[PDB]
């Protein structure tokens, strides 16, 4: 005669997580994906009677409502028929086998589940438990659906990555530990949504809106930067990083996200764009939005909505910091994979999201989503942020001379193809560079490209073309470029006119941050070159280590400029940014890596200077190889001395993993190393 009550519940966590593709997270919680059933075993006191029934109630967030679909009340039946459902699969004794399902349109996040029991004309409710519901890229009806297994593994399940960096003259790469499976990372990424400006202002609407990956993606693009909202990372492109980490020293998202949380959600210092993108990639992959990291070389910042940026030099060959716009050696951002119900079926697929604080959008430093397809066709009136993104990959560039001691500027040239090159992302299943420029623009030099350019420009808001120049100029590198060694370049000029010409050349070298921030002059010279018709000449350029050492930043970049002129013709501007090599830093595993077995690693580094290096630190990390971030204090190394440092790691997950290190010291900040390790069962 006892009234119907719940004894206990088996959530079958391990089994359900494997089925839901959530088993990798380091977490004891039940983590599920939306639109997919999960099975529980619920043990009652008595067998059900007629006149008895069970309902489940699920809710998420602080103001759950049925109409906003943040609360659902659904009966234990045989029926499915839309929304949330609970199918009684079998009864055996007082044990019910139950298959519970959520809709493909369910908001993501943390849910509570309760049971409402109808027995003897009574109604009661008991809280059962809590779970996490994520986006479901395995489900054909999910907006984030990604139908290719191998792609899904890369774009959702892979926690080690590669971000392309450097310049058009030398594309390099750094490893990045996404670490979306590491302790507390999924939880921290869910927290982000609970701290945005939108959540603080109107949590009921924010929570309802977490069914939409456009909305989640956009919120993350705001919350990963500190601006406006005390989000994760504070940007710094000044070359002075006092009070924080040099942006280049980070090797992943894990310590950033943990350091944010554990500081009471106060900004982490400091980031540059690949750090924002790395961290945004982690959050996206953790929540189930397939995502990848894009690098655009020669990336324009257009601040005034005309698809053109200006760069300025003085007659002496100094680059000038003038006007708000700029051109970056590279800029990194993200793509997330989802359909766009707001735009129409032709604009689904890859969508640009950018957490780097550049432009305010709707009053906030956020960016995207922008359909990549829509950018390539210049449909820049579509949501979101497409004028700014089109300009990054395809603005025209105008070079100007400016002489402050006349106040005159004059137009030197226009370059319609230099912006937006070698747009790169990590290959699926390897570290190869995949080139995706053709996804963002029609080919440089095609008619399409120029037609797309004018269409886009149309959607928004006198010179004389003098002779072909007599002089053509080019800068070439002579030999090695390595911090600690001299720089040798050659300026090659040629006179293509029929007359003898006398060329006046004014040359400078400035240390720069990779976004084009000028740090300091380190060398300058002038030269006069007499050239016969068709004669080529070389002018050697030499910059000592002593000359650049004090002003070179962790970017290791120097901007070399030569402004060349002959009487009665416009200046010719010759330009090269160089990157100087760090000293070599290697990691090697001294045995084969096996799950759960210690394995010794060795770090080698040779000090190439004639001076000692001090304050030597090695930071190491890699998901599935060690837990968190190891710090090793390395003793002062004498000139030309080598360091040999050994340490154990403890592989926890089989497969191809990535070990990352940073070696910083007084004379060399942020030397990077990366080792792929095969971890066998």
């Amino acid at each position, epitope marked *: 005669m006892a009234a119907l009550g719940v004894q206990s519940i088996n959530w079958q966590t391990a089994f359900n997580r494997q089925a839901h593709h959530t088993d990798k997270f380091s977490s004891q919680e039940l983590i599920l994906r939306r639109g997919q059933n999960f099975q529980v075993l619920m043990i009652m006191n008595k067998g059900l009677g007629s006149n008895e029934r069970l309902e489940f109630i699920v809710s998420t967030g602080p103001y759950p409502s049925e109409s906003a679909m943040t609360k659902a009340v659904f009966p234990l039946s045989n029926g499915s028929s839309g929304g949330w459902s609970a199918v009684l699969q079998a009864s055996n004794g007082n044990t019910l086998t139950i298959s519970i399902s959520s809709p493909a349109s369910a908001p993501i996040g943390r849910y509570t589940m309760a049971l409402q029991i109808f027995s003897q004309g009574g109604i009661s409710s008991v809280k059962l438990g809590t779970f996490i519901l994520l986006f479901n890229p395995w489900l054909n009806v999910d907006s984030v659906f990604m139908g290719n297994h191998a792609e899904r593994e890369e774009y959702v399940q892979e926690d080690a990555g590669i971000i392309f960096v450097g310049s058009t003259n030398r594309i390099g790469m750094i490893g990045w530990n996404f670490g979306q499976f590491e302790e*507390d990372i999924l939880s921290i990424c869910l927290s982000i949504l609970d701290r945005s400006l939108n959540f603080r202002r109107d949590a009921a609407t924010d929570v309802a809106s977490r069914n939409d990956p456009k909305y989640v993606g956009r919120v993350l693009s705001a919350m990963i930067n500190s601006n406006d909202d005390n989000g994760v990372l504070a940007g710094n492109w000044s070359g002075t990083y*006092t*009070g*924080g*980490r040099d942006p280049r020293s980070w090797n992943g998202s894990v310590e950033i996200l943990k*350091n*944010w*949380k*554990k*500081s*009471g959600f*106060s900004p*982490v*210092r*400091y980031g540059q764009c690949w750090v924002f993108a790395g961290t945004l990639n982690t959050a996206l992959r953790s929540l189930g939005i397939p995502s990848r990291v894009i690098t655009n070389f020669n990336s324009a910042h257009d601040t005034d909505r005309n698809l053109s940026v200006d760069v300025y030099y003085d007659p002496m060959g100094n680059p000038l910091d003038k006007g708000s716009d700029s051109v970056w050696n590279f800029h990194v951002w993200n793509e997330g994979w989802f359909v766009r119900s707001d735009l129409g079926p032709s604009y689904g697929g890859w969508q640009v999201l950018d957490a780097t604080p550049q432009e305010r959008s709707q009053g906030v430093f956020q960016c995207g989503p922008a359909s990549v397809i829509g950018v390539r066709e210049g449909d820049v009136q579509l949501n979101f942020d497409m004028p700014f993104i089109f300009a990054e990959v395809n603005a025209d560039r105008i070079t100007w001379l400016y002489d402050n001691t006349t106040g005159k500027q004059w137009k030197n040239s226009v370059n319609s193809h230099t912006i937006g090159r070698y747009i790169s992302t990590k290959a699926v299943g390897s570290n190869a560079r995949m080139d995706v420029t053709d996804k963002y623009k029609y080919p440089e030099g095609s008619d399409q490209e120029r037609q797309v350019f004018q269409k886009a420009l149309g959607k928004l808001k006198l010179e004389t073309e003098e002779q072909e120049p007599s002089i053509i100029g080019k800068l070439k590198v002579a030999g090695m470029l390595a911090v600690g060694k001299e720089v040798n370049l050659v300026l090659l000029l040629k006179n293509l006119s029929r007359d003898t010409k006398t060329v006046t050349v004014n040359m400078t070298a400035w240390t720069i941050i990779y976004n084009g921030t000028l740090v300091h002059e380190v060398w300058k010279d002038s030269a006069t070159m007499s050239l016969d018709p068709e004669e080529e000449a070389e002018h050697p350029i030499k910059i000592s280590y002593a000359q650049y050492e004090k002003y070179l930043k962790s970017d290791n970049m120097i901007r070399i400029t030569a402004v060349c002129k002959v009487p009665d013709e416009s200046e010719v501007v010759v330009e090269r940014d160089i990157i100087l090599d760090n000293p070599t830093l290697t990691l090697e595993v001294l045995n084969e890596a096996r799950v759960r077995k210690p394995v010794n690693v060795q770090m080698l580094f040779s000090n190439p200077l004639d001076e000692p290096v001090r*304050d030597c630190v090695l930071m190491v990390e890699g998901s599935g190889l060690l*837990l*968190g*971030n*190891l*710090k*090793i*204090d390395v003793p002062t190394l004498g000139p030309k001395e080598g360091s040999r440092v050994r340490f154990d790691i403890l592989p926890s997950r089989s497969g191809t993993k990535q070990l990352l290190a940073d070696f910083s010291c007084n004379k060399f900040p942020a030397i990077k190393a990366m080792l792929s390790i095969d971890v066998a069962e």
Partner: antibody
């Protein structure tokens, strides 16, 4: 290696003042928060005060608020605690400590000096 | 604000494992990093664990830290105890304002 050397300690009657100094060397001073932590003979550790890397954020324990002032000087790579209206329960060994954390507002004491003795009694 | 509560004393024999708890009185232990320090008579404290469970350069792998959300506590575990491990130990955490220390535990290595 990091060295923290505290000075300015001594004996003083209730009501009077002392100025503690801490010289830092062997790391980049201005990258870190710094702290005073004190220990009374035979007792535990009691945090006294913190000052951010850039001096802009300061915090004090309730038992010293309004009477002690923390400050630092970049050029002198030094940390100070100006203690006014001293009470007998301020008697302790005063440690200077470098914060562990670089680039986040979490707090831990990675290196401690040997301390400077403050004795308050009539 | 919150308190951190440690046992007054623990003991164990040489070669064995001993654990020292540190219970946060309000808010979640997980919210802020925990540090551990060792102090010997006549000496300033030294750090033995930072960031809940990371070991500084120099500290033996016999020392470990952990966190237990269900008891709202942090722990320091020392295995293969040696006589030189006998000392006072302190936990420490913080909120955005204030740094908080545990009251200290005297570890005796039973002789």
């Amino acid at each position: 290696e990091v060295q923290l050397v505290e000075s300015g300690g001594g004996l003083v009657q209730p009501g009077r003042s002392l100025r503690l100094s801490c010289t830092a060397s062997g790391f980049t001073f201005d990258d870190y928060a710094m702290h005073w932590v004190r220990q009374a003979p035979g007792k535990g550790l009691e945090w006294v005060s913190r000052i951010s890397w850039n001096s802009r954020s300061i915090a004090y324990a309730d038992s010293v608020k309004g009477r002690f002032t923390i400050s630092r000087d970049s050029a002198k790579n030094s940390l100070y605690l100006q203690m006014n209206s001293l009470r007998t329960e301020d008697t302790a060994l005063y440690y200077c400590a470098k914060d562990h954390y670089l680039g986040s507002d979490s707090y831990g004491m990675d290196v401690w000096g040997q301390g400077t003795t403050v004795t308050v009694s009539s | 604000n919150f308190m951190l509560t440690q046992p007054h004393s623990v003991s164990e024999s040489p070669g064995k494992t001993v654990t020292i708890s540190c219970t946060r009185s309000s808010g979640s232990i997980d919210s802020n990093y925990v540090q551990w320090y060792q102090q010997r008579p006549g000496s300033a404290p030294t750090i033995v664990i930072h960031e809940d469970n990371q070991r500084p350069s120099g500290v033996p792998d016999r020392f470990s830290g952990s966190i237990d959300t269900s008891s709202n506590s942090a722990s320091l575990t020392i295995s293969g105890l040696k006589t030189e491990d006998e000392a006072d130990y302190y936990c420490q955490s913080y909120d955005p304002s204030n740094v908080v220390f545990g009251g200290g535990t005297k570890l005796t290595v039973l002789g």
